[PDB]
């Protein structure tokens, strides 16, 4: 029972939102390379089986645990009860796989999947609606906790939870069962400070995505008004240990260590697999992230 478990995400191989990126890379190549690199587990991708027996049939022979899966929320247009029914299939799969977390994100009005929409036109939730949105998220979180699953909210570019102020609003209007998924890459991309977010909310963090960014490319997205998927194809994201990145990982992991964080560190770095070889960059990500966690005192 290692306290800290290192996972990966299959979008470094095949992107979910833009199905042309890594379409040629089979599920088999993705999982073989993820296991060969040394990851303890992997998160859901769009090529994964969604039935317990079939999913174990591909994961267990490779020694990969099912970390979690992304689940889209539509609390801004659907009732809380309908959203509870929507996540139940995901909860069933996670329990059978032994997963302890469900990753969630409000995507009813999100634009990260719209290749033609500039990221600056992303949705902003009207101020008065935060309280009700929070009650809905926490209602889903209490529902999942009753079945042994912890809901972790994934702040994300192109959604209503993008900036550091909006992360603060979410945490303010949720609790006690709602946890935060701290994604370092999305936080900095959204002009936030990963270290400051961790200092504020580490007690509520239940899942960590160690995602890096190339500052050069992020500023290209801003200056030229590009879409999220345009930025992904240009290399807006990369892995821990890449000298082209700008995220400072040790301070964040040090805050986690000081509060006794237990759970997953996941390297999630979508890139164009033709240009940024997934085996190479995910290999560099795992090596570098373990070194950072050792330096931070997080992994003893
Ligand atoms: Mn993420």
Coordinates of C-alpha atoms and ligand atoms in Angstrom, one line a residue:
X1 CA 0.0 0.0 0.0
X2 CA 2.2 2.8 -1.3
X3 CA 0.9 6.1 0.1
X4 CA 1.6 7.9 -3.2
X5 CA 0.6 6.4 -6.5
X6 CA 1.8 7.7 -9.8
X7 CA -0.7 7.5 -12.7
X8 CA -1.0 8.7 -16.3
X9 CA -3.8 9.8 -18.6
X10 CA -4.3 8.3 -22.1
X11 CA -4.8 11.7 -23.8
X12 CA -1.0 12.0 -24.1
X13 CA -1.5 9.1 -26.7
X14 CA -5.0 9.8 -28.1
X15 CA -6.9 13.0 -27.4
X16 CA -10.5 12.7 -26.4
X17 CA -11.8 16.1 -27.6
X18 CA -9.9 16.1 -31.0
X19 CA -10.2 12.5 -32.3
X20 CA -7.6 13.1 -35.0
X21 CA -4.8 13.4 -32.5
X22 CA -3.3 10.0 -32.0
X23 CA -6.1 8.2 -33.7
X24 CA -3.5 5.7 -35.0
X25 CA -2.3 4.7 -31.6
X26 CA -4.3 1.7 -30.5
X27 CA -5.5 1.2 -26.9
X28 CA -3.0 -1.7 -26.8
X29 CA 0.0 0.5 -27.6
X30 CA -1.2 3.1 -25.1
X31 CA -1.5 0.6 -22.2
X32 CA 1.6 -1.3 -23.1
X33 CA 3.7 1.9 -23.0
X34 CA 2.0 3.1 -19.9
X35 CA 2.8 -0.1 -18.1
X36 CA 6.3 -0.3 -19.5
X37 CA 7.1 3.2 -18.3
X38 CA 6.3 2.2 -14.8
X39 CA 3.0 3.9 -14.0
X40 CA 0.9 2.4 -11.2
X41 CA -2.4 3.2 -13.0
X42 CA -4.1 5.1 -15.7
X43 CA -7.2 7.2 -16.0
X44 CA -10.1 6.7 -18.4
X45 CA -9.7 7.5 -22.1
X46 CA -12.2 7.3 -24.9
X47 CA -10.8 4.0 -26.2
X48 CA -11.3 2.2 -22.8
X49 CA -13.9 -0.5 -22.3
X50 CA -16.7 0.8 -20.0
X51 CA -17.8 -2.6 -18.7
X52 CA -16.0 -4.0 -15.6
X53 CA -15.0 -7.4 -17.0
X54 CA -13.7 -6.0 -20.3
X55 CA -11.8 -3.2 -18.6
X56 CA -10.1 -5.5 -16.2
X57 CA -9.3 -7.8 -19.2
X58 CA -7.0 -5.1 -20.6
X59 CA -5.7 -3.5 -17.4
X60 CA -5.0 -6.3 -15.0
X61 CA -2.6 -8.2 -17.2
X62 CA -0.5 -5.0 -17.5
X63 CA -0.6 -4.4 -13.7
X64 CA -2.4 -1.1 -14.2
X65 CA -5.0 0.2 -11.7
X66 CA -8.0 2.1 -12.9
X67 CA -7.3 5.5 -11.4
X68 CA -10.6 7.2 -12.2
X69 CA -12.7 8.5 -15.1
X70 CA -13.9 11.9 -16.3
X71 CA -17.6 12.5 -15.9
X72 CA -19.4 15.5 -17.3
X73 CA -21.8 17.5 -15.2
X74 CA -24.8 19.4 -16.5
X75 CA -26.1 21.0 -13.3
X76 CA -26.6 24.3 -15.1
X77 CA -29.4 22.8 -17.2
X78 CA -30.5 19.6 -15.5
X79 CA -32.0 18.9 -12.1
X80 CA -29.9 17.5 -9.3
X81 CA -31.8 14.2 -9.4
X82 CA -31.2 13.8 -13.1
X83 CA -27.5 14.4 -12.6
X84 CA -27.4 11.8 -9.8
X85 CA -28.9 9.3 -12.3
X86 CA -26.3 10.4 -14.9
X87 CA -23.3 9.6 -12.7
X88 CA -24.6 6.3 -11.4
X89 CA -23.1 4.2 -14.2
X90 CA -19.7 5.8 -13.6
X91 CA -20.0 5.1 -9.8
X92 CA -20.8 1.4 -10.6
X93 CA -17.8 1.0 -12.8
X94 CA -15.5 2.7 -10.3
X95 CA -16.6 0.5 -7.4
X96 CA -16.1 -2.7 -9.4
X97 CA -12.6 -1.5 -10.4
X98 CA -11.7 -0.5 -6.8
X99 CA -11.3 3.2 -7.7
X100 CA -11.8 5.7 -4.9
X101 CA -12.4 9.0 -6.8
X102 CA -14.7 10.3 -9.5
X103 CA -13.5 13.2 -11.6
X104 CA -16.3 15.7 -12.5
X105 CA -16.6 18.9 -14.4
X106 CA -19.5 21.1 -15.6
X107 CA -19.4 21.0 -19.4
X108 CA -23.0 22.0 -20.4
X109 CA -21.6 25.3 -21.7
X110 CA -17.9 24.5 -21.9
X111 CA -15.9 25.4 -25.0
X112 CA -12.7 23.5 -24.6
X113 CA -14.0 21.0 -27.2
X114 CA -15.0 23.7 -29.7
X115 CA -12.1 23.9 -32.1
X116 CA -13.4 27.2 -33.5
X117 CA -14.2 29.1 -30.3
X118 CA -11.4 31.3 -29.0
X119 CA -10.6 30.5 -25.3
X120 CA -11.4 34.1 -24.4
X121 CA -15.0 33.5 -25.1
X122 CA -15.3 30.9 -22.4
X123 CA -18.4 30.9 -20.2
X124 CA -18.6 32.9 -17.0
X125 CA -21.2 31.9 -14.5
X126 CA -23.4 34.8 -13.5
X127 CA -22.6 35.8 -10.0
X128 CA -25.9 35.0 -8.4
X129 CA -25.8 31.4 -9.6
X130 CA -22.8 30.2 -7.7
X131 CA -24.6 29.3 -4.5
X132 CA -27.1 26.9 -6.3
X133 CA -24.3 25.4 -8.5
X134 CA -22.3 24.7 -5.4
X135 CA -25.3 23.1 -3.7
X136 CA -25.7 20.9 -6.7
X137 CA -22.1 19.9 -6.8
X138 CA -22.1 19.1 -3.1
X139 CA -25.3 17.1 -3.5
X140 CA -23.6 14.9 -6.1
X141 CA -20.6 14.7 -3.8
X142 CA -22.6 13.5 -0.9
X143 CA -24.3 11.0 -3.2
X144 CA -21.0 9.5 -4.3
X145 CA -19.5 9.5 -0.8
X146 CA -22.5 7.3 0.3
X147 CA -21.2 4.7 -2.1
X148 CA -17.5 5.0 -1.1
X149 CA -16.5 7.3 -3.9
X150 CA -15.0 10.8 -3.4
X151 CA -16.0 13.5 -5.9
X152 CA -13.1 15.7 -7.1
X153 CA -13.9 18.7 -9.1
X154 CA -11.6 19.4 -12.1
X155 CA -11.2 23.1 -12.8
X156 CA -10.6 23.5 -16.5
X157 CA -9.9 26.1 -19.2
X158 CA -13.0 26.8 -21.2
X159 CA -15.4 26.0 -18.3
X160 CA -17.0 28.2 -15.6
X161 CA -14.4 27.1 -13.1
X162 CA -11.2 28.4 -14.7
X163 CA -9.6 31.2 -12.6
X164 CA -8.3 31.1 -9.1
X165 CA -11.1 33.3 -7.9
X166 CA -13.6 30.8 -9.3
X167 CA -11.9 27.9 -7.6
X168 CA -12.3 29.9 -4.4
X169 CA -16.0 30.4 -5.1
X170 CA -16.5 26.7 -5.7
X171 CA -14.7 25.7 -2.4
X172 CA -16.7 28.4 -0.6
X173 CA -20.1 27.1 -1.8
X174 CA -19.4 23.4 -1.3
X175 CA -18.4 21.0 1.5
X176 CA -17.8 18.9 3.3
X177 CA -17.8 16.1 0.8
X178 CA -16.7 18.1 -2.3
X179 CA -13.0 17.8 -2.9
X180 CA -10.8 19.7 -5.4
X181 CA -8.8 18.1 -8.2
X182 CA -5.7 20.4 -8.3
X183 CA -4.5 20.5 -11.9
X184 CA -1.3 22.6 -11.9
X185 CA -1.3 23.1 -15.7
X186 CA -4.9 24.3 -16.0
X187 CA -4.4 26.5 -12.9
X188 CA -1.4 28.4 -14.4
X189 CA -3.0 28.5 -17.8
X190 CA -6.0 30.2 -16.2
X191 CA -3.6 32.8 -14.7
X192 CA -3.7 31.2 -11.3
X193 CA -0.9 30.4 -8.9
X194 CA -0.6 26.6 -8.2
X195 CA 1.3 27.1 -5.0
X196 CA -1.2 29.6 -3.6
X197 CA -4.2 27.4 -4.6
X198 CA -2.5 24.5 -2.8
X199 CA -1.8 26.6 0.3
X200 CA -5.5 27.7 0.5
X201 CA -7.2 24.4 -0.3
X202 CA -4.8 21.5 0.3
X203 CA -7.1 20.2 3.0
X204 CA -9.8 19.8 0.4
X205 CA -7.6 18.4 -2.4
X206 CA -8.4 14.8 -3.1
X207 CA -6.6 14.3 -6.5
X208 CA -3.6 16.0 -8.2
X209 CA -2.8 16.3 -11.9
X210 CA 0.9 17.2 -12.4
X211 CA 0.4 19.0 -15.7
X212 CA 3.1 21.4 -17.0
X213 CA 2.7 24.3 -19.5
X214 CA 4.9 25.9 -22.1
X215 CA 4.7 29.6 -21.3
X216 CA 5.6 30.6 -24.8
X217 CA 2.7 28.7 -26.3
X218 CA 0.2 29.8 -23.6
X219 CA 1.0 33.4 -24.5
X220 CA 0.5 32.6 -28.2
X221 CA -3.0 31.4 -27.3
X222 CA -3.7 34.7 -25.5
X223 CA -2.0 37.0 -28.1
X224 CA -3.5 35.3 -31.2
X225 CA -6.9 34.5 -29.6
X226 CA -6.6 30.8 -30.3
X227 CA -8.9 28.0 -29.2
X228 CA -8.1 25.4 -26.5
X229 CA -7.5 22.6 -29.1
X230 CA -5.3 24.9 -31.1
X231 CA -3.2 25.4 -28.0
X232 CA -3.0 21.7 -27.4
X233 CA -1.8 21.0 -30.9
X234 CA 0.8 23.8 -30.6
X235 CA 2.1 22.3 -27.3
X236 CA 0.5 24.4 -24.6
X237 CA 1.0 21.5 -22.1
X238 CA 4.0 19.3 -21.3
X239 CA 5.3 17.1 -18.5
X240 CA 7.1 17.6 -15.2
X241 CA 10.9 17.9 -15.8
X242 CA 10.6 19.5 -19.2
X243 CA 12.9 22.5 -19.4
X244 CA 10.4 24.2 -21.7
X245 CA 7.8 24.1 -18.9
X246 CA 7.2 26.8 -16.3
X247 CA 5.2 25.1 -13.5
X248 CA 7.2 24.9 -10.2
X249 CA 6.2 21.5 -8.9
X250 CA 8.3 21.1 -5.7
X251 CA 6.5 23.9 -3.7
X252 CA 3.1 22.4 -4.5
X253 CA 4.2 18.8 -3.5
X254 CA 5.8 20.3 -0.4
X255 CA 2.5 21.8 0.8
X256 CA 0.8 18.4 0.1
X257 CA 3.5 16.6 2.1
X258 CA 3.1 19.0 5.0
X259 CA -0.6 18.1 5.2
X260 CA -0.1 14.3 4.8
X261 CA -1.7 14.1 1.3
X262 CA -2.4 10.5 0.3
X263 CA -3.5 9.3 -3.1
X264 CA -2.7 9.8 -6.7
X265 CA -0.3 12.1 -8.6
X266 CA -1.3 11.9 -12.3
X267 CA 0.7 13.1 -15.2
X268 CA -1.9 14.4 -17.6
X269 CA -0.3 16.2 -20.6
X270 CA -2.2 16.2 -23.9
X271 CA 0.1 16.9 -26.8
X272 CA 0.2 16.1 -30.5
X273 CA 1.7 12.5 -30.3
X274 CA 3.2 12.9 -33.8
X275 CA 5.5 15.7 -32.6
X276 CA 5.7 15.1 -28.9
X277 CA 6.3 11.3 -28.5
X278 CA 4.1 10.1 -25.7
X279 CA 6.5 7.4 -24.5
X280 CA 9.4 9.9 -24.4
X281 CA 7.5 12.7 -22.6
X282 CA 5.5 10.4 -20.2
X283 CA 8.8 8.7 -19.3
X284 CA 10.4 12.0 -18.6
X285 CA 7.3 13.0 -16.6
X286 CA 7.3 10.0 -14.3
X287 CA 11.0 10.1 -13.6
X288 CA 10.9 13.9 -12.9
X289 CA 7.7 13.8 -10.8
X290 CA 9.1 11.1 -8.5
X291 CA 12.2 13.1 -8.0
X292 CA 10.2 16.1 -7.2
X293 CA 8.0 14.2 -4.7
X294 CA 11.1 12.9 -3.0
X295 CA 12.6 16.4 -2.8
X296 CA 9.3 17.7 -1.4
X297 CA 9.1 15.1 1.4
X298 CA 5.9 13.8 -0.1
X299 CA 7.2 10.3 -1.1
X300 CA 9.1 8.7 1.8
Ligands
LIG1 MN1 -6.4 17.3 -15.5

